[PDB]
Ligand binder design. Sequence first.
Ligand SMILES: [Mg+2]
Ligand SMILES: [Mg+2]
Ligand SMILES: [Mg+2]
Ligand SMILES: [Mg+2]
Ligand SMILES: [Mg+2]
Ligand SMILES: [Mg+2]
Ligand SMILES: [Mg+2]
Ligand SMILES: [Mg+2]
Ligand SMILES: [Mg+2]
Ligand SMILES: [Mg+2]
Ligand SMILES: [Mg+2]
Ligand SMILES: [Mg+2]
Ligand SMILES: [Mg+2]
Ligand SMILES: [Mg+2]
Ligand SMILES: [Mg+2]
Ligand SMILES: [Mg+2]
Ligand SMILES: [Mg+2]
Ligand SMILES: [Mg+2]
Ligand SMILES: [Mg+2]
Ligand SMILES: [Mg+2]
Ligand SMILES: [Mg+2]
Ligand SMILES: [Mg+2]
Ligand SMILES: [Mg+2]
Ligand SMILES: [Mg+2]
Ligand SMILES: [Mg+2]
Ligand SMILES: [Mg+2]
Ligand SMILES: [Mg+2]
Ligand SMILES: [Mg+2]
Ligand SMILES: [Mg+2]
Ligand SMILES: [Mg+2]
Ligand SMILES: [Mg+2]
Ligand SMILES: [Mg+2]
Ligand SMILES: [Mg+2]
Ligand SMILES: [Mg+2]
Ligand SMILES: [Mg+2]
Lengths: 129, 140, 152
Amino acid sequence: VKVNILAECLKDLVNAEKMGKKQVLLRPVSKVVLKFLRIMQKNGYIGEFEVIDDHRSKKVVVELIGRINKCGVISPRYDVPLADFEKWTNNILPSRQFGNVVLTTTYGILTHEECRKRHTGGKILGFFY
Amino acid sequence: GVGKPRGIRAGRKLARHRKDQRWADNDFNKRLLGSRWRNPFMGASHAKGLVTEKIGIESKQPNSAVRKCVRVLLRKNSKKIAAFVPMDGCLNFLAENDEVLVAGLGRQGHAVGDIPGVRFKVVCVKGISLLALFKGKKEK
Amino acid sequence: GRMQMKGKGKGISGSALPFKRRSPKWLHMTPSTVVDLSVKLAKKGLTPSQIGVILRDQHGIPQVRFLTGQKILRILKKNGCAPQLPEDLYFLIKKALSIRKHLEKNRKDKDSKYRLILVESRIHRLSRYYKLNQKLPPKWKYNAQTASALVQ
RNA sequence: AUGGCAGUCACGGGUAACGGAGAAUUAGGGUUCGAUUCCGGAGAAGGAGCCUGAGAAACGGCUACUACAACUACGGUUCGGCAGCAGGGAAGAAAAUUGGCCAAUCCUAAUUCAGGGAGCCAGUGACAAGAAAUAGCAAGCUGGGAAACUUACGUUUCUACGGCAUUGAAAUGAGAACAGUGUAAAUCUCUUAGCGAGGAACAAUUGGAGGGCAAGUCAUGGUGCCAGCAGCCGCGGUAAUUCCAGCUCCAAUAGCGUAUAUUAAAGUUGUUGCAGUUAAAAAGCUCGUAGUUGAACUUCUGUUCAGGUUCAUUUCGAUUCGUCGUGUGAAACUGGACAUACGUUUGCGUAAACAUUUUACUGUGAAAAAAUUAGAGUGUUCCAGGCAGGUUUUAGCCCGAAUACAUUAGCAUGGAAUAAUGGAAUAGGACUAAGUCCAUUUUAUUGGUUCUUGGAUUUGGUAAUGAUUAAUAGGGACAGUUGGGGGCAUUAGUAUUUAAUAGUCAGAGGUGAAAUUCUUGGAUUUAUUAAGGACUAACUAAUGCGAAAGCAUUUGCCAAAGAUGUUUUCAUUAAUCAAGAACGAAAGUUAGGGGAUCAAAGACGAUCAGAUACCGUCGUAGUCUUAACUAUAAACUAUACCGACUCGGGAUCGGCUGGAAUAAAUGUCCAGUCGGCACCGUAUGAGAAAUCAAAGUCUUUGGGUUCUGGGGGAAG
RNA sequence: GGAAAAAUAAGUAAACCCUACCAUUUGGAACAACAAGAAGUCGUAACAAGGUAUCUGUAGGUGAACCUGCAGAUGGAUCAUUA
Ligand SMILES: [Mg+2]
Ligand SMILES: [Mg+2]
Ligand SMILES: [Mg+2]
Ligand SMILES: [Mg+2]
Ligand SMILES: [Mg+2]
Ligand SMILES: [Mg+2]
Ligand SMILES: [Mg+2]
Ligand SMILES: [Mg+2]
Ligand SMILES: [Mg+2]
Ligand SMILES: [Mg+2]
Ligand SMILES: [Mg+2]
Ligand SMILES: [Mg+2]
Ligand SMILES: [Mg+2]
Ligand SMILES: [Mg+2]
Ligand SMILES: [Mg+2]
Ligand SMILES: [Mg+2]
Ligand SMILES: [Mg+2]
Ligand SMILES: [Mg+2]
Ligand SMILES: [Mg+2]
Ligand SMILES: [Mg+2]
Ligand SMILES: [Mg+2]
Ligand SMILES: [Mg+2]
Ligand SMILES: [Mg+2]
Ligand SMILES: [Mg+2]
Ligand SMILES: [Mg+2]
Ligand SMILES: [Mg+2]
Ligand SMILES: [Mg+2]
Ligand SMILES: [Mg+2]
Ligand SMILES: [Mg+2]
Ligand SMILES: [Mg+2]
Ligand SMILES: [Mg+2]
Ligand SMILES: [Mg+2]
Ligand SMILES: [Mg+2]
Ligand SMILES: [Mg+2]
Ligand SMILES: [Mg+2]
């Protein structure tokens, strides 16, 4: 039974980066998966990606180079007040020097950094480094 | 998988599950039901008692010697207790029916070394220390 | 995947809708004519599904909703011929009853007793749905004796 | 009247439980305590009951009882109630003086002046905390280092530093005192005269030298598995690195051992974060309610303006020990603006009203107890800490007593994501016009008409009238199949046992040998039949079906099932699962049947030292069957279920799709593919390994959900 | 008119009995273990094909381990023979 489409797509992704694969077919997909990809791409990890419209959910091909050391989802999507940021960046990320924890906020989906600059927080999605 | 719920409404099941499994941890168990209070010391650190018997106890294998001991009647409990008498010829500092101060052997309820099953040691005789007496600081 | 078969139930039976949503080019039937045929078939006491099959094999109508815009049941509803109890539940109860029938006579048949348990299980499980979604009267229950007189 | 509460744990137990403020530990998350300074609450030996008051169930008030304390001339009495202070007794392992004052702090009162075991002062005080002596500097003799020189040793220096049962005087507190400070007085401190240091004194201990664990490479003495050591491993039995001692050395050090509870160690309670094939651990198996968990779609986007905030630097500058200004572009914003585009309408960027379905969540803010804690300022001689201080401008002046934190729930307000929930599918739903009712503030008042307004209702008109896909999700329909799935009937087949009818004879059985057995009443043996219970051989396989247990003869009937095939239908209907249910080998139980084979018990033979065993001859219950119970197995892949994703290769069972050959088909072969059971290679994936294509995608630790384990025994 | 004793009715209700229980301790006739150790006794069940392969469920027997019946598991002493 499918729970958490972000989780499917993220794990399948990491797997293919790990196998040295040059691209990934990703199915099925959501807004959140595409915004997460738009985020990783904007941030330098994945490359160009293409969305495929089958009349239903969708498919997504992702050009990867190789950068991603890991990209995960956290489930459940916990509540992350601004106070708790320290915790999550220390627990999840490889080092202070890089890597992101992505969150949903009422201001939208953000690098935890974008959250300090937007001064908000509260819903954790996943991470990549 | 992991056989363990992850979900944000899962809180009580998680915490209850621990409140259960916690019982398999021994120190928790022994703590939680009074176990301490029922032991011959009644939870206490030391105890005073009377000496019923001076008794030799043959050591566990592979050691041979005669461990000098005493059976004491604890004044608080009126329980009978088998206690070891430390160092050398200290069994002599003891007379039958004295007041005696007794403590654990350091395993908290269990016997140490070659003395089988004996969980306690002698500390004071009448009022004085076995140490004080041994080194001959005071006299009985 | 297949419901209530744990361990190995899991496989894919076919249907795959083509990409073109527009009705096919070779098809000359007006949506109205289609609604006529489908209602004739309906009044003859057919199932929305059985109607679908008939239209597809015999009549060269691949997907009725891509022609009309209305799915088959909705058409039946508007045009007033309605299958009072949903075809869905209808068959499940027909079945549970055929099992009742065979089982009253062979009382030593254990597999069929277990199969019955499964089918009734599904029936209740469907009842809840059709009830919360207002497709079934709120006090409606499946019992042996109640459902046996229930149009099945 | 028949309700109220309960798996979202009621009700009831337990607490060596008064609740907080807080305390000990703490990478983070936690764990464990809070009798005890502050705030609540409760009680005055136990219960109850009162008086009087503004306030009391008071208890340093009364009445009674239960249990006690003090007097008694015995008849009576008590201003009899330590969980106030001090002090006794008792209990215990465990805790101080029957002291001095109202000077300070505050309280009470007819009150400036009186009272106060509140409080303060002193005593006891290795609870606990802070600072800190137990010796310092040289000489001379040296160890050593180092250079240089000297070719081999001598000399000269000592940014090394050491060492002296030797010499030298200086330095100073512990001690002890005149005085002065301080006090209600007394003590102590602080300041200080006269005094107070050369060696067993003005002398530190408590634990240790095998490992963990710092320290013996004592040819040390004693003891010889004794006495004893040892948290654990172990040491000791005549050469002890472990006992008893001596020397030396080590570790903490005015402290240091030991016992017990608790904290880290513990990823050995795991949310972060553990394990469950074989180390303890997946429930025999399905259904399923609570619970937990849930597929994708909706103002995407582009263009322009401004404000900062960042960035970069072949733009520069100014000055300076680095900021500032400025470029220019580049970002993510934030906010305007137009684009079918986060709203009307009104009064002066801000209010309201209207409209926007609710919330979780998140950002602010209000409300917030001090002491704590974090922390600014400040030299209590440092420091613990305190809340003070700093200055000759002195009938003064300067400056402080911050700030953060204050979790949950209430409150206020900003919010676009995410998550839940909503809205128009029997629609007068929405807007608008025109009617009908029911109310209706104002028009100083009641009455009719009206007006407004605000509800309901009828009908025309306007609008794009209103139903997202259709999950390689799930349910259902249907079509050709497939199966040792199930239930009824049927039906065969030899076989064992027995009988009949024929034959023939002396031995059959059984064993390692044998003996019990059977045999002339003719066994074993042979032929033909028949009876009666079981059982389905061979084909039979790393093949099939069933939820598991389990299921194998023919045919007929009855209901059921997967996979495949679908340009069929429904449209989230699903996953897992405490409750609660259906099954569930064998053995066993109850009531009837049946009884051929085997066959627990039993009877015997043999074997053996003994066999109450393995072997043999018998044989009951059982084995089979109806109705019922029973619920268990190494019920085993010792491997939970749903879902993704990660290698390669043939083959196999069931569908389907093409293609090819023939003797033209329910058969072959070939190539696809979906689903099964597996196998063979291989992993730069996993593991303690055996091994594992899952037992992989795990410290780079989180897809969903039940269950189980926490050293061994005791003990299922 | 005020008012003490004494009485009165209903209530608050301490204490003491009887019935039936719960909690925390505790006395106790009679039963009565378990773990550890080794130079006691009888035999040798298990480890090797432990000399009858073990082991699970069950049932019966029985100085003692154990033995036997039925169904099961290799954790087996077999990953394996149609002609
Ligand atoms: Mg422990
Ligand atoms: Mg200790
Ligand atoms: Mg030992
Ligand atoms: Mg000493
Ligand atoms: Mg599937
Ligand atoms: Mg507490
Ligand atoms: Mg108080
Ligand atoms: Mg209050
Ligand atoms: Mg007192
Ligand atoms: Mg006074
Ligand atoms: Mg004092
Ligand atoms: Mg101190
Ligand atoms: Mg003086
Ligand atoms: Mg001296
Ligand atoms: Mg010692
Ligand atoms: Mg020696
Ligand atoms: Mg020594
Ligand atoms: Mg085992
Ligand atoms: Mg969703
Ligand atoms: Mg607009
Ligand atoms: Mg026959
Ligand atoms: Mg027969
Ligand atoms: Mg077959
Ligand atoms: Mg019978
Ligand atoms: Mg013989
Ligand atoms: Mg026989
Ligand atoms: Mg073909
Ligand atoms: Mg592991
Ligand atoms: Mg490896
Ligand atoms: Mg393999
Ligand atoms: Mg994990
Ligand atoms: Mg009683
Ligand atoms: Mg024993
Ligand atoms: Mg023995
Ligand atoms: Mg038995």
